[PDB]
Amino acid sequence: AMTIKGRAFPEGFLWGGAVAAHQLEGGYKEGGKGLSTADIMTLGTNERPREITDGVVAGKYYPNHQAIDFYHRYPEDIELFAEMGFKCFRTSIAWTRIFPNGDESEPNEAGLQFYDDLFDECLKNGIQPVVTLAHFEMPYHLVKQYGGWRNRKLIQFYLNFAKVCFERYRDKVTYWMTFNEINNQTNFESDGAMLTDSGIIHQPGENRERWMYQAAHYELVASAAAVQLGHQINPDFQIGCMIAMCPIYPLTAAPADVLFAQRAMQTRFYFADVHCNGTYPQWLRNRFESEHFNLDITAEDLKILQAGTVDYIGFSYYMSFTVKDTGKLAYNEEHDLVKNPYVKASDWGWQVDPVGLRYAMNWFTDRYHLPLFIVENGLGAIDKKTADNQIHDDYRIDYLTDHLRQIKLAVLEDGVDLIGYTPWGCIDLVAASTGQMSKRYGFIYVDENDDGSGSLKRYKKDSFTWFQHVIATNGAEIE
Amino acid sequence: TIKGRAFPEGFLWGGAVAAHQLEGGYKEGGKGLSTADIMTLGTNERPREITDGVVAGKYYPNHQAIDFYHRYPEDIELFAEMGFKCFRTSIAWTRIFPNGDESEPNEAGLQFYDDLFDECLKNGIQPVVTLAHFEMPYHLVKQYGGWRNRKLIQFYLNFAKVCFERYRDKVTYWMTFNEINNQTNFESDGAMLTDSGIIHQPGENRERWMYQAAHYELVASAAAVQLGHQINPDFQIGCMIAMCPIYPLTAAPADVLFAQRAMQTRFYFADVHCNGTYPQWLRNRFESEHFNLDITAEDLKILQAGTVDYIGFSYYMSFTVKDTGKLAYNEEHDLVKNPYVKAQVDPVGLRYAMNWFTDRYHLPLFIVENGLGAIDKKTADNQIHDDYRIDYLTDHLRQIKLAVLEDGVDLIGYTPWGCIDLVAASTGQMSKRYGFIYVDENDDGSGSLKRYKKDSFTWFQHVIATNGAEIE
Ligand SMILES: [Cl-]
Ligand SMILES: [Cl-]
Ligand SMILES: [Cl-]
Ligand SMILES: [Cl-]
Numbered sequence A: 001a002m003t004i005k006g007r008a009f010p011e012g013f014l015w016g017g018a019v020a021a022h023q024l025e026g027g028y029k030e031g032g033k034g035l036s037t038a039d040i041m042t043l044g045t046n047e048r049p050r051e052i053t054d055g056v057v058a059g060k061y062y063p064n065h066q067a068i069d070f071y072h073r074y075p076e077d078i079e080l081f082a083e084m085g086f087k088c089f090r091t092s093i094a095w096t097r098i099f100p101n102g103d104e105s106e107p108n109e110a111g112l113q114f115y116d117d118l119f120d121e122c123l124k125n126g127i128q129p130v131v132t133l134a135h136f137e138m139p140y141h142l143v144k145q146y147g148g149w150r151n152r153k154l155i156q157f158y159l160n161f162a163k164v165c166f167e168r169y170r171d172k173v174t175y176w177m178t179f180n181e182i183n184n185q186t187n188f189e190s191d192g193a194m195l196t197d198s199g200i201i202h203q204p205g206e207n208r209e210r211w212m213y214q215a216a217h218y219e220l221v222a223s224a225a226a227v228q229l230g231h232q233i234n235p236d237f238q239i240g241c242m243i244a245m246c247p248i249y250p251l252t253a254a255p256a257d258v259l260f261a262q263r264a265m266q267t268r269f270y271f272a273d274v275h276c277n278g279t280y281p282q283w284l285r286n287r288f289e290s291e292h293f294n295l296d297i298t299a300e301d302l303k304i305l306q307a308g309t310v311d312y313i314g315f316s317y318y319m320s321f322t323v324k325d326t327g328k329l330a331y332n333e334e335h336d337l338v339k340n341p342y343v344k345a346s347d348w349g350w351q352v353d354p355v356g357l358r359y360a361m362n363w364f365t366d367r368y369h370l371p372l373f374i375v376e377n378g379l380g381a382i383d384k385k386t387a388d389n390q391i392h393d394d395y396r397i398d399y400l401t402d403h404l405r406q407i408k409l410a411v412l413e414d415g416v417d418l419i420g421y422t423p424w425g426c427i428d429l430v431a432a433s434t435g436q437m438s439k440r441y442g443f444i445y446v447d448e449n450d451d452g453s454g455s456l457k458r459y460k461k462d463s464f465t466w467f468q469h470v471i472a473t474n475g476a477e478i479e
Numbered sequence B: 001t002i003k004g005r006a007f008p009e010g011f012l013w014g015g016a017v018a019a020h021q022l023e024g025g026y027k028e029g030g031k032g033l034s035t036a037d038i039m040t041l042g043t044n045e046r047p048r049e050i051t052d053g054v055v056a057g058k059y060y061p062n063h064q065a066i067d068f069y070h071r072y073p074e075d076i077e078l079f080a081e082m083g084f085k086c087f088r089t090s091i092a093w094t095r096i097f098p099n100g101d102e103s104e105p106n107e108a109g110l111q112f113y114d115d116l117f118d119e120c121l122k123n124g125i126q127p128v129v130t131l132a133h134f135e136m137p138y139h140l141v142k143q144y145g146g147w148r149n150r151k152l153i154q155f156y157l158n159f160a161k162v163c164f165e166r167y168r169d170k171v172t173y174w175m176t177f178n179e180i181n182n183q184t185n186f187e188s189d190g191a192m193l194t195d196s197g198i199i200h201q202p203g204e205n206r207e208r209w210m211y212q213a214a215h216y217e218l219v220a221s222a223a224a225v226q227l228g229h230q231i232n233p234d235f236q237i238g239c240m241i242a243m244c245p246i247y248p249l250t251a252a253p254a255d256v257l258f259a260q261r262a263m264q265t266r267f268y269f270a271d272v273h274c275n276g277t278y279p280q281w282l283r284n285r286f287e288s289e290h291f292n293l294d295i296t297a298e299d300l301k302i303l304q305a306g307t308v309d310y311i312g313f314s315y316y317m318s319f320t321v322k323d324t325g326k327l328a329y330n331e332e333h334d335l336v337k338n339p340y341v342k343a344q345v346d347p348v349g350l351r352y353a354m355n356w357f358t359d360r361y362h363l364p365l366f367i368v369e370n371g372l373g374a375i376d377k378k379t380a381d382n383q384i385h386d387d388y389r390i391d392y393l394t395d396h397l398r399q400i401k402l403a404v405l406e407d408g409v410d411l412i413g414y415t416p417w418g419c420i421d422l423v424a425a426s427t428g429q430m431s432k433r434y435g436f437i438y439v440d441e442n443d444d445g446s447g448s449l450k451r452y453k454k455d456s457f458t459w460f461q462h463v464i465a466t467n468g469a470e471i472e
Helices: A070-084 A109-123 A140-146 A154-168 A191-198 A208-233 A255-277 A282-290 A299-307 A354-368 A394-412 A462-472 B068-082 B107-121 B138-144 B152-166 B189-196 B206-231 B253-275 B280-288 B297-305 B347-361 B387-405 B455-465
Strands: A014-018 A088-092 A128-134 A175-179 A238-244 A248-250 A312-316 A321-323 A372-376 A418-421 A444-446 A458-460 B012-016 B086-090 B126-132 B173-177 B236-242 B246-248 B311-314 B319-321 B365-369 B411-414 B437-439 B451-453
Touching: A014 A070, A014 A128, A014 A372, A070 A109, A070 A458, A070 A462, A109 A128, A109 A154, A128 A154, A128 A372, A140 A154, A154 A208, A175 A208, A191 A208, A208 A238, A208 A255, A208 A299, A238 A255, A248 A255, A248 B246, A255 A282, A255 A312, A255 A321, A255 A354, A255 B347, A312 A354, A354 A372, A354 A394, A354 B253, A354 B347, A394 A418, A394 A462, A458 A462, B012 B068, B012 B126, B012 B365, B068 B107, B068 B451, B068 B455, B107 B126, B107 B152, B126 B152, B126 B365, B138 B152, B152 B206, B173 B206, B189 B206, B206 B236, B206 B253, B206 B297, B236 B253, B246 B253, B253 B280, B253 B311, B253 B319, B253 B347, B311 B347, B347 B365, B347 B387, B387 B411, B387 B455, B451 B455
Parallel strands: A014 A088, A014 A418, A088 A128, A128 A175, A175 A238, A238 A312, A248 A321, A312 A372, A372 A418, B012 B086, B012 B411, B086 B126, B126 B173, B173 B236, B236 B311, B246 B319, B311 B365, B365 B411
Antiparallel strands: A444 A458, B437 B451
16 A cells, blocks of 8 residues: 655755765875874774774784875765765764864864865765764874863863864855764773773773763763854754664563663663753763762753754664663663574675664654754675676665665655765775775775775776665655 | 652652542532443443433443542541542533533532532642543533534633633642543544544544544643643643553564554654644654544644643553554554563553653653552451552552652652542443442442441551652
8 A cells, every 4th residue: 555666755855975084084194184093093803803002003004094095086086976966975074184182272274174175076066065073083182181081171172173163164064963973982891982982091990981971971061062152153054963873672572671671772872862852861860879970060061951952863873782681770781782583684694674773763753853864874795896897786785775765664654854864985985893994885996905905996886876876866766 | 779768758649530430429410411421331241331321221330439429528538547648530521511512610510629629628638630531521422423523622621711710729730631542542432432422433434533533632632731821820731641551572673663653653642742743653644544634723833832731641551562564553453462471560661651751751740540450358357458459559659669769750649540449441340449448339339338448548558658768
């Protein structure tokens, strides 16, 4: 009876692609650019974690130094994006190109000039930049000198950075987001999440949980202040949060499983609660008191939080989680997740849950009643370039199709308000988890090996063509 | 731990009833015939017969009930001894407007509630009033088609205005429509009659007419919040929601999405009551099913300005669902057993439901129904040992206590259902008992109607006098 084929996405829908500066740009030293926390992360494997080193240690390979050299090649890459018909380009402004060490009193003109040029290049091509301010690339100086977001000073260092960007680019960007995947540090035991989100490398004697919430608080306050500041520079600016949206199912209908899963979602998405409601949920305030965290939270902080709630919720989606009741009060993401036996290998071997995206979209809408922006979704897989220089990546086409199907249902049937959709790593870039080029997400193949060798030549994948057609038909054919 | 910690200062402990389930005096003081007054006695496997007015030869248990209309002084004596802070009841619509469409209220019905409320207030017990509680005038059902008809909005408002004005110095908490979301089960004739005064006409699209009637009710609720706030700006005017949380049976993504939609369907009423607008998924449904409902721009403006001050709710059970394959939730066919709950009583769902309401709406809550229906036996020495009832209420109160003290849910009070044994809604039986007070009435209406304290009476007395501090 009901069908979605033949029906277009809404008019004005922002199809695009998504990246982060540190994962594609390279030129990590060009133009007086500072050493970021991305620049101290060595290459790893599927089995071997990336090494966080103290500065650039000698005889180690850092894949973010060159990446795919987009700092220099962006006009060629953007032409490929306009050939696909992108309506937007989601990327980050490297904090380290604008304030290399993060505490300077004036910005870096060479860095500001780069984004002028990059954005001018997008805009003459019909492509509006969608910009994330903090994206796992903060000045390492801030980590060494201040202890990262342990320190309330980062609130003003962040705002200096946002101010300069808001003003410089105020006729060039409409959509901004403050802190990429701010809620990864929900897993406070993940060294990767503490560094990327908050620039925290654990010190002996520290309560990891306590300092995550201290750090998240300051960032949430910084985000709220940036919304207000932002709206003052350009009232047309749409300013959003960025949430990693892994929904957490109860394993079974056992009441205690269902309650525990509620508390896991509450714990993982309190960040969104603050961004959107302007206040801390009361259960978490109660947790702050009963664990005696004694957090540095001022009455000024709370007023800023309540005036600086966001215009929309940008999120990533990749997977869903499952939990059963542990007997325990709190959700610890490192230890409490169980296997979901109802989700099995797809035709291509990897597990996905496209239904959870629909679920997630209804969960955001019914809770906050704000527009959403899907700014990260994609398949990381091995691609082979054939002798005749093609990549037949129908495993990537299927992946995106299965997800787009559910998104199309969420919007057309469920009536969820979606600004757009920008699949992750539209051009093959350095993967966050391992720093391998080999784990590829792109519509565009970049001839680079994991050791950084290769010509770096761009080639179209078959998915490039499939996605061009989707944009050209505004998603009408998706069934 | 929570052991030794009190509920918040001023927590409204009490008991709840509905005028039609306990008053009796169904023709007294010019009282009109209600929809409760046309329902015969039934059992578990035998629906209450609906009749067209009162037929001779049939027994109607609500006609007499437990005679609280004449016995309220004795009965309130027992509530005051138990130590109630509030008494949650309905004002019988047919006592104030017998046919429902009169231009003037009935002075004797109004004076009954003056007498009743003053009797409560002289003992430190504040009334908490639900305006529509399954007892609308049968004149409105018969001649207008109940809430199928837009004219009922004004009829409700004439009723509400009068009650707000008359009891302005005597009632702080009000609620508009009892369990407004029972009619989610649009295949349920009982739910349709009790919520919306709809006796089915063949040819009629049940679901469509539900949505239409529920719309006018939501509009009337919105408009009465504004009216009451104008009459006494210190009034708290809430909704009343039947909170049956719906669990996915397994973590299968299709089961999880279906449970989301099941709860979206069942609780959109709450969405409209609190958010002040229709959820977009449902509006889309109105379009794709071609309901062509009567919804004006003016309706949408009243709704948005008339959102409630708090959420009143009943809690008895949770439901479970698996994916059916279908696009829509049908509550008459789509529920499956929860194999993880003892043989569906579920105290932890209460805690869940409280967080759910709180995280979704961020409004204060009021638990206005909760309790255990059971066959109570009176011993030869006139004791009722309802240890099962104390266990049930303790299990629920413990979950309520965690929700409030740890989870920081904003709870106004707690009034268990049927604090004095009354006529059950499901069957019209006395023998399915909920009370702290046992009433000696058989299902055919015979007996002394004498009152006795069940063991739970003294238990709840001590819960109140310690403000829940021993609950662990
Ligand atoms: Cl998954
Ligand atoms: Cl990274
Ligand atoms: Cl659905
Ligand atoms: Cl929610």
